[PDB]
Design a protein around this motif. Structure first.
Motif, PDB file in Angstrom:
ATOM      1  N   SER A   1     -26.773  72.522  20.755  1.00 24.19           N
ATOM      2  CA  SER A   1     -27.419  72.011  21.268  1.00 24.19           C
ATOM      3  C   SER A   1     -27.906  71.886  22.720  1.00 24.19           C
ATOM      4  O   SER A   1     -27.651  72.730  22.979  1.00 24.19           O
ATOM      5  CB  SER A   1     -26.489  70.876  21.492  1.00 24.19           C
ATOM      6  N   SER A   2     -28.779  71.496  23.610  1.00 22.11           N
ATOM      7  CA  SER A   2     -29.174  71.209  24.170  1.00 22.11           C
ATOM      8  C   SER A   2     -28.775  71.773  25.555  1.00 22.11           C
ATOM      9  O   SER A   2     -28.993  71.987  26.765  1.00 22.11           O
ATOM     10  CB  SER A   2     -30.934  70.545  24.436  1.00 22.11           C
ATOM     11  N   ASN A   3     -27.458  70.920  25.218  1.00 25.12           N
ATOM     12  CA  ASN A   3     -26.670  70.407  26.828  1.00 25.12           C
ATOM     13  C   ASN A   3     -26.079  72.419  26.997  1.00 25.12           C
ATOM     14  O   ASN A   3     -25.059  72.129  27.993  1.00 25.12           O
ATOM     15  CB  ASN A   3     -26.110  69.631  27.111  1.00 25.12           C
ATOM     16  N   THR A   4     -25.940  73.384  25.873  1.00 16.82           N
ATOM     17  CA  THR A   4     -24.707  74.658  25.714  1.00 16.82           C
ATOM     18  C   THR A   4     -25.714  75.557  25.891  1.00 16.82           C
ATOM     19  O   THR A   4     -25.515  75.984  26.029  1.00 16.82           O
ATOM     20  CB  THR A   4     -23.811  74.372  25.405  1.00 16.82           C
ATOM     21  N   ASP A   5     -26.884  75.290  24.583  1.00 13.12           N
ATOM     22  CA  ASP A   5     -27.431  76.252  24.556  1.00 13.12           C
ATOM     23  C   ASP A   5     -28.858  76.733  23.741  1.00 13.12           C
ATOM     24  O   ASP A   5     -29.685  77.931  23.208  1.00 13.12           O
ATOM     25  CB  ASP A   5     -26.596  77.524  22.712  1.00 13.12           C
ATOM     26  N   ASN A   6     -29.268  75.493  24.132  1.00 13.25           N
ATOM     27  CA  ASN A   6     -30.455  75.405  23.276  1.00 13.25           C
ATOM     28  C   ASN A   6     -30.652  75.963  21.644  1.00 13.25           C
ATOM     29  O   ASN A   6     -31.636  75.947  21.485  1.00 13.25           O
ATOM     30  CB  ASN A   6     -32.194  75.010  24.118  1.00 13.25           C
ATOM     31  N   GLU A   7     -29.429  76.261  21.013  1.00  5.04           N
ATOM     32  CA  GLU A   7     -30.041  76.031  20.000  1.00  5.04           C
ATOM     33  C   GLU A   7     -30.367  75.520  19.105  1.00  5.04           C
ATOM     34  O   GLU A   7     -29.730  74.252  19.246  1.00  5.04           O
ATOM     35  CB  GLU A   7     -28.985  77.660  19.148  1.00  5.04           C
TER      36      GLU A   7
HETATM   37  C1  LIG Z   1     -32.395  73.543  27.138  1.00  2.28           C
HETATM   38  O1  LIG Z   1     -33.549  73.646  27.547  1.00  2.28           O
HETATM   39  C2  LIG Z   1     -34.859  73.278  28.502  1.00  2.28           C
HETATM   40  C3  LIG Z   1     -36.572  72.946  28.738  1.00  2.28           C
HETATM   41  O2  LIG Z   1     -36.291  74.003  28.679  1.00  2.28           O
HETATM   42  C4  LIG Z   1     -33.679  72.859  30.341  1.00  2.28           C
HETATM   43  O3  LIG Z   1     -33.979  71.624  31.035  1.00  2.28           O
HETATM   44  C5  LIG Z   1     -32.332  72.934  29.697  1.00  2.28           C
HETATM   45  O4  LIG Z   1     -31.653  73.835  31.597  1.00  2.28           O
HETATM   46  C6  LIG Z   1     -31.700  74.535  28.681  1.00  2.28           C
HETATM   47  N1  LIG Z   1     -30.439  73.849  29.101  1.00  2.28           N
HETATM   48  C7  LIG Z   1     -30.100  75.396  28.859  1.00  2.28           C
HETATM   49  C8  LIG Z   1     -28.081  75.502  28.501  1.00  2.28           C
HETATM   50  O5  LIG Z   1     -30.554  76.351  27.882  1.00  2.28           O
END
Ligand SMILES: *[C@@H]1O[C@H](CO)[C@@H](O)[C@H](O)[C@H]1NC(C)=O
Ligand SMILES: *[C@@H]1O[C@H](CO)[C@@H](O[C@@H]2O[C@H](CO)[C@@H](O[C@@H]3O[C@H](CO[C@H]4O[C@H](CO)[C@@H](O)[C@H](O)[C@@H]4O)[C@@H](O)[C@H](O[C@H]4O[C@H](CO)[C@@H](O)[C@H](O)[C@@H]4O)[C@@H]3O)[C@H](O)[C@H]2NC(C)=O)[C@H](O)[C@H]1NC(C)=O
Ligand SMILES: CC(=O)N[C@H]1[C@H]([C@H](O)[C@H](O)COC(C)=O)O[C@@](O[C@H](CO)[C@@H](O)[C@@H]2O[C@@](O)(C(=O)O)C[C@H](O)[C@H]2NC(C)=O)(C(=O)O)C[C@@H]1O
Ligand SMILES: *[C@@H]1O[C@H](CO)[C@@H](O[C@@H]2O[C@H](CO)[C@@H](O[C@@H]3O[C@H](CO)[C@@H](O)[C@H](O)[C@@H]3O)[C@H](O)[C@H]2NC(C)=O)[C@H](O)[C@H]1NC(C)=O
Ligand SMILES: *[C@@H]1O[C@H](CO)[C@@H](O[C@@H]2O[C@H](CO)[C@@H](O)[C@H](O)[C@H]2NC(C)=O)[C@H](O)[C@H]1NC(C)=O
Ligand SMILES: *[C@@H]1O[C@H](CO)[C@@H](O[C@@H]2O[C@H](CO)[C@@H](O)[C@H](O)[C@H]2NC(C)=O)[C@H](O)[C@H]1NC(C)=O
Ligand SMILES: *[C@@H]1O[C@H](CO)[C@@H](O[C@@H]2O[C@H](CO)[C@@H](O)[C@H](O)[C@H]2NC(C)=O)[C@H](O)[C@H]1NC(C)=O
Ligand SMILES: *[C@@H]1O[C@H](CO)[C@@H](O)[C@H](O)[C@H]1NC(C)=O
Ligand SMILES: *[C@@H]1O[C@H](CO)[C@@H](O)[C@H](O)[C@H]1NC(C)=O
Length: 268
Positions: free
Chosen positions: A233-239
């Motif tokens: 998920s976006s709050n942890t790894d953006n996968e």
């Molecule tokens: C996920 O991607 C967004 C956009 O690049 C970024 O703002 C965020 O800090 C990222 N979070 C992680 C955990 O990589």
């Protein structure tokens, strides 16, 4: 619901999480996506007209993958996600490559294919286990709300998609390896004259035959199981998970084979 067995009531709610709808992408077969290799035949440096179970070109894929964390929605286990199988489906599946202490792990959604999903009927289940594709066709006591887990990163709930305390009858049970490093897997799943057929590729786009299975009954539904994970998920790894499906139908394609027998191109 998928099956009718009450496996759990832990963290179930009725929320419509897909306010942004089932995601969509367009079928383009011009580079051999949606095609498969023919029987035991090799064609070299040539174009063939062939009638097979293929996508409609320019149709949509639907992304039916459903990542959860703790809660499951009852609305995930209904139309539009619970889907009519008809002749079959073509899947384009993202291999979600996760890491623990720099070791790579492969995750993607399980698909179940069946009719009533009751233990008086066979359910085909295709499940990854980090480079092993476990395929079974058994009289599973499917859960109402079936799901899988990240075995790599863990999950806030245990895996349950069936409840068979003693081993159910199976028509089929095989493991096929797949390359954990590839970004995409492709599948054809189809039925003809009471026999189910599976093709896959973990490398390139044109799929190759895995197995066939006599069922003696019509398959009518499929469902891509939710996967619950503390990662992805976006709050942890953006996968992300992605499990793109589109209907098969009996279609004539042009197929182009290169001088090493690979299907490089196709036309619907
Ligand atoms: C996920 O991607 C967004 C956009 O690049 C970024 O703002 C965020 O800090 C990222 N979070 C992680 C955990 O990589
Ligand atoms: C094939 O698949 C079918 C489903 O399609 C399975 O059938 C179900 O099996 C379960 C388990 O035996 C039946 O369970 C019902 O449990 C209710 C109570 O559950 C709570 O309490 C128990 C402990 O007592 C816990 O184990 C459980 O986790 C829950 O916390 C009972 O109230 C149900 O009783 C029914 O019958 C009595 C009369 O005898 C009635 O008074 C009740 O109202 C009720 O109708 C029952 O025991 C479940 O009901 C089954 N469903 C169906 C449709 O039959 C098969 O087990 C499976 N077969 C195989 C071989 O795998
Ligand atoms: C099918 C779908 O819609 N899938 C998305 C999912 C669901 O919409 C949500 O689960 C539904 O929930 C119901 C049914 O009630 O939301 C996800 O994103 C969350 C925020 O929406 C995510 O950030 C989570 O936020 C938390 O506040 C929380 O508990 O939801 C803390 C938790 O630790 C954290 N998860 C982690 C760390 O992975 C998720 O993942 O779950 C991204 C998924 O793509
Ligand atoms: C196909 O691949 C799957 C996934 O690798 C295989 O399933 C796994 O098989 C092992 C060995 O039988 C199981 O481990 C054993 O589990 C029992 C019960 O917990 C435990 O008592 C034993 O000591 C041992 O740990 C494992 O649970 C099982 N499932 C998973 C998800 O790993 C399967 O055996 C392969 N072969 C075939 C023909 O399907
Ligand atoms: C599905 O099964 C769960 C148990 O896994 C049932 O939940 C229990 O319901 C009884 C009702 O008297 C409560 O006393 C318990 O506290 C509940 N929780 C547990 C963990 O046992 C649930 O009622 C079943 N049916 C449905 C429709 O969810
Ligand atoms: C693949 O087939 C094509 C078509 O027959 C071959 O291309 C021709 O090759 C000759 C020289 O060998 C040229 O004079 C022609 O102009 C080519 N035609 C076209 C349409 O390009 C090709 O050589 C074959 N390659 C292999 C490795 O079999
Ligand atoms: C497993 O999949 C990976 C990723 O597709 C393969 O790695 C590629 O291998 C070729 C040579 O065969 C290289 O030209 C590419 O640059 C590699 N790509 C990456 C991203 O490393 C790998 O060869 C496959 N292994 C097996 C046994 O199938
Ligand atoms: C979920 O919300 C979207 C956006 O409002 C809507 O199109 C969709 O029909 C809703 N689904 C259900 C099952 O209500
Ligand atoms: C997961 O299974 C273990 C072992 O049965 C149990 O202790 C734990 O409470 C279960 N958790 C959930 C959320 O089901």
């Amino acid at each position: 619901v998928i099956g009718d067995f009450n496996c759990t009531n832990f963290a179930i709610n009725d929320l419509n999480t897909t306010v942004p709808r089932i995601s969509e992408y367009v079928v383009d077969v011009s580079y051999g996506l949606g095609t498969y290799y023919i029987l035991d035949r090799v064609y070299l440096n040539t174009t063939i007209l062939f009638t097979g179970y293929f996508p409609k070109s320019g149709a949509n894929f639907r992304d039916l993958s459903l990542k959860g964390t703790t809660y499951l929605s009852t609305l995930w286990y209904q139309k539009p996600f619970l889907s009519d199988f008809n002749n079959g489906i073509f899947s384009r599946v993202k291999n979600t490559k996760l890491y623990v202490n720099k070791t790579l792990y492969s995750e993607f959604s399980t698909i179940v294919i069946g009719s009533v999903f009751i233990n008086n009927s066979y359910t085909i289940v295709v499940q990854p286990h980090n480079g092993v594709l476990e395929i079974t066709a058994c009289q599973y006591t499917m859960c109402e709300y079936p799901h899988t887990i990240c075995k790599s990163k863990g999950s806030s709930r245990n895996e349950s998609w069936h409840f068979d305390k003693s081993e159910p009858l199976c028509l089929f049970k095989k493991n096929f390896t797949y390359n954990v490093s590839t970004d995409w897997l492709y599948f054809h799943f189809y039925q003809e004259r009471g026999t189910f057929y599976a093709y896959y590729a973990d490398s390139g786009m044109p799929t190759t035959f895995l197995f066939s299975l006599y069922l003696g009954t019509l398959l009518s539904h499929y469902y891509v199981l939710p996967l619950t994970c503390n990662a992805i998920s976006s709050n942890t790894d953006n996968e992300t998970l992605q499990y793109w499906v589109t209907p098969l139908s009996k279609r004539q394609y042009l197929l182009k084979f290169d001088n090493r027998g690979v299907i490089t191109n196709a036309v619907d």
